[PDB]
């Protein structure tokens, strides 16, 4: 059990990492097809 | 695919190279002035069935055996030489009923044109199939893989030899396990895969060469020939042109040739 | 600057053939022109023979230095280093 | 072509230039007459075979060391501590396992030149001891753990305290470390082999000296054999 | 039909670049790493099939692991071309777009060749790094064949490492082409080594390196 909640916290913070990822992510998506909109 | 013998037997068709010349069976050029008309009468019936410039006629007849065998259409083999001449020439073709598969052909002193023409189509038209593979064969093969209980039992599956290679081409087509397409020519391995793979393909057919009548040589021995053979990036050829060509002393090197 | 110091010697603490074959002829050849031998001697004769007696005991005085690729080199005594 | 080629005193194999041909002799640093065809054992046969031969449950009576080949196989079990080091060895072999299945033997092929013949030492060392007898062996579960963890780290192809030095002697002695975890493991050197204590540091002590000795020598011409 | 292979390869090069992206230290969403050919064809292909390759250029950030690792790691830039063979005046637009928008790389993907006198002006856009691909040899990822092991790129702390380590000169490490075919999909500088982790069966795991040139 000791292991399976060590496992669960890791877990958990890689989906965290991913989301803030993510995050920061949609910001270029966004720039990146408003600039392809520019060039169109 | 590789445990379906019918989707193997249509990848081995799509890949290998098939050409006009292949097909057709003969070639003629006849003079017929009249455009919505003819004066052979065995392809009158035809050409009039379809109707309901110049007077040189090019027509030539496609083999019906190979043609099916090659599982082509008429409509194809038009479509395919329209591309190739846009507009340039009028073409009609036999239907599949007909007794012999035709295909006419006028352009829209010009008999040696039409002559040259005739070569030029007979010489680079491309039906389908990767350029540079003459000849493909179905071949089975034996991998062992584990099974579900974790023993290993052997297994057989579909696979493609061709002959002439075209390993950039070949790996694209769909349906292929581009990860494990390999060619016995570590030249085009080089120029496709990296230096890498150079490496372990020039390890591979040394082995198969010195292991085909049961020999057997230590792994280190062809593992240092072949990482000096590819130690500089590129192939280094055993000659003269290849040992001469490094920064070693000109005493060690003139020793050579 | 080249010498590599005592505690920083990397190179196998073992003698190898080659080694062995040259120390031993080296010693051979010393021992042929009159060297002392620094091994007592019961009823041996050969300079081979006497050779193989002092490297079996780690008696030879000599010191193998051992060439890296750089330049560099580790200095060994023949009494330090192992022999099979 | 491949005259002035020649193991130097860092194990490399370089030309006359200096450059460097590859960064150990064979990928392996060992000399070609000092190898045999053996088997590793890890890799063939079906998980339950595998489970049976390498698994040992210190809670389930009727799974565990049989008792009339122990001395101590009354206070063993029950044990954790115990369990815990009969887990992580074989956590351990599974991992060899994988390796060996999944990267380097994919065909599954178990046949290949290693140094040093284990079944020859083992052998040796059963007649040397007289193994033979019903006689239960004084060797713990421990000791066994220990000494062969202990073992596979002092195979040295590469000296020095470096850390790249350290990584790239790890992975010379893979595969051999493979095939001594898959002999030496805890359940077979109790039952199928009945190693007594004597024997097995007269074992571990000759695997040792003898890869020793199995190395390449600096200053082969290996490129002119 | 033709047109459903065009899109089909079309979609099989634009997920290989976008693989190596990420190989190279950018960050790709695992959404848009995913991302199908149905979905591929609702987004690009119009109401005719056909499709821009303007609307599939991208940007990307280094992750933090990757610009800690390498300092050097900019903001990257990868656009598809339109036109099917390139010249001079395309090649100078997308140079100054590139120092307009202050890119450190921009990869630029055309369809059948590009020009001597485009390929010309690649080495003067500095400091900016351009890198042009084709199309075709991007349908296949070469970096998942079986005979191409894992090439990880070294920083230069590592680098001088091992030259230490080994006591070497540069020159004296095996040598990978700046043209191979991996060292290109790496995206590798004259210069930079290259720690290359391969199957052995002597020893079951090999590591060798390599410099670019």
Avoid at chain 1, 10 to 33: G, N, V
Avoid at chain 2, 108 to 118: A, F, G, P, S, V
Avoid at chain 3, 26 to 49: C, F, K, Y
């Amino acid at each position: 059990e000791k292991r399976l909640e060590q496992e669960q916290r890791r877990l958990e913070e890689a989906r965290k990492r991913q989301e803030a990822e993510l995050i920061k992510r949609q910001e270029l998506i966004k720039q990146a097809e408003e600039w392809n909109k520019m060039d169109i | 695919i590789a445990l379906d013998i019918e989707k193997a037997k249509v990848i081995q068709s799509s890949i290998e190279y098939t050409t006009l010349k292949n097909v057709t069976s003969a070639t003629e050029i006849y003079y017929d002035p009249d455009p919505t008309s003819t004066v052979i009468e065995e392809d009158f019936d035809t050409v009039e069935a379809y109707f309901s410039q110049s007077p040189w006629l090019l027509r030539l007849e496609l083999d019906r055996a190979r043609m099916l065998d090659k599982q082509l259409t008429m409509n194809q083999v038009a479509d395919k030489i329209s591309e190739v001449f846009s507009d340039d020439l009028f073409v009609m073709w036999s239907e599949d009923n007909a007794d012999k598969l035709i295909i006419r052909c006028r352009v829209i002193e010009e008999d040696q044109m039409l002559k040259r023409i005739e070569a030029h189509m007979l010489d680079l038209i491309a039906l389908r199939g990767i350029p540079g593979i003459s000849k493909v064969y179905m071949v089975k093969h034996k991998v062992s893989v584990p099974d579900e209980s974790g023993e290993y039992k052997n297994e057989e599956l579909w696979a493609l030899e061709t002959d002439g290679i075209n390993l950039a081409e070949v790996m694209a087509v769909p349906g292929v396990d581009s990860s494990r397409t390999y060619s016995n020519s570590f030249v085009e391995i080089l120029s496709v895969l990296g230096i890498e793979a150079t490496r372990s393909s020039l390890y591979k057919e040394i082995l198969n060469v010195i292991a085909f009548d049961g020999s057997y040589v230590n792994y280190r021995h062809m593992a240092l020939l072949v990482d000096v053979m590819t130690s500089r990036g590129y192939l280094m050829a055993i000659t003269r042109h290849g040992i001469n060509r490094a920064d070693t002393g000109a005493l060690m090197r003139c020793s050579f040739e | 600057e080249l010498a590599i110091l005592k505690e920083e010697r990397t190179t196998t603490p073992y003698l190898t053939k080659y080694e062995r074959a040259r120390i031993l002829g080296t010693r051979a050849l010393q021992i042929s022109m009159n060297a002392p031998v620094l091994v007592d001697i019961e009823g041996e004769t050969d300079p081979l023979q006497i050779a193989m007696k002092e490297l079996s005991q780690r008696k030879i005085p000599l010191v193998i230095r051992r060439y890296l690729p750089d330049g560099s080199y580790e200095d060994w005594g023949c009494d330090e280093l192992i022999v099979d | 072509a491949l005259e002035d080629i020649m193991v130097h005193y860092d194990g490399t194999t370089r030309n006359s230039l200096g450059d460097i041909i590859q960064f150990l002799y064979g990928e392996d640093g060992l000399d070609g007459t000092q190898v045999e065809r053996q088997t590793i054992d890890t890799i063939p046969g079906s998980d339950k075979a595998f489970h049976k031969r390498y698994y040992v449950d210190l809670m389930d009576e009727k799974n565990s060391i049989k008792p009339d080949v122990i001395e101590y196989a009354a206070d063993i079990l029950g044990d954790v501590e115990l369990q815990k080091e009969l887990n992580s060895e074989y956590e351990q072999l599974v991992s060899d396992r994988k390796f060996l299945r999944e990267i380097v033997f994919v065909n599954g092929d178990h046949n290949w030149p290693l140094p040093v013949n284990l079944r020859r030492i083992i052998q040796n060392a059963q007649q040397i001891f007289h193994l033979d007898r019903a006689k239960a062996s004084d060797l713990t579960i421990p000791e066994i753990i220990h000494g062969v963890r202990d073992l596979c780290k002092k195979l040295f192809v590469l000296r020095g305290e470096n850390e790249l030095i350290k990584e790239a002697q790890q992975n010379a002695t893979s595969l051999f470390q493979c095939l001594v975890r898959a002999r030496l493991a805890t359940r077979r050197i109790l039952e199928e082999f009945r190693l007594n204590r004597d024997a097995f540091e007269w074992v571990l002590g000759t695997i040792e000296a003898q890869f020793q000795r199995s190395l390449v020598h600096p200053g082969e011409m290996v490129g002119v054999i | 039909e033709d047109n459903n292979r065009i899109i089909s390869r079309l979609w099989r090069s634009f997920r290989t670049v976008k693989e190596m992206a990420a190989d190279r230290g950018y960050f790709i969403s695992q959404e848009e790493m995913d991302q199908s050919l149905e979905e591929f064809r609702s987004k690009i292909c119009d109401s005719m099939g056909n499709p821009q390759r303007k609307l599939m250029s991208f940007l990307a950030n280094p992750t933090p692991e990757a610009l800690e690792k390498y300092s050097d790691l900019g903001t990257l830039w990868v656009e598809f071309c339109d036109e099917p063979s390139v010249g001079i005046k395309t090649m100078r637009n997308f140079c100054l777009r590139i120092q307009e928008k202050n890119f450190s790389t921009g990869i630029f993907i055309y369809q059948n060749n590009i020009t001597p006198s485009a390929n010309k002006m690649i080495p003067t856009v500095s400091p900016a790094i351009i890198e042009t691909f084709q199309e075709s040899d991007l349908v296949v990822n070469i970096t998942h064949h079986e005979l191409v092991p894992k090439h990880i790129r070294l920083s230069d702390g590592e680098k001088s490492q091992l030259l230490q380590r080994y006591k070497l000169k540069e020159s004296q490490l095996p040598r990978i082409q700046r043209e191979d075919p991996v060292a290109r999909y790496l995206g590798l500088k004259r210069g930079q080594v290259v720690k290359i982790i391969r199957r052995s069966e002597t020893s079951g795991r090999y590591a060798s390196y390599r410099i670019c040139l």
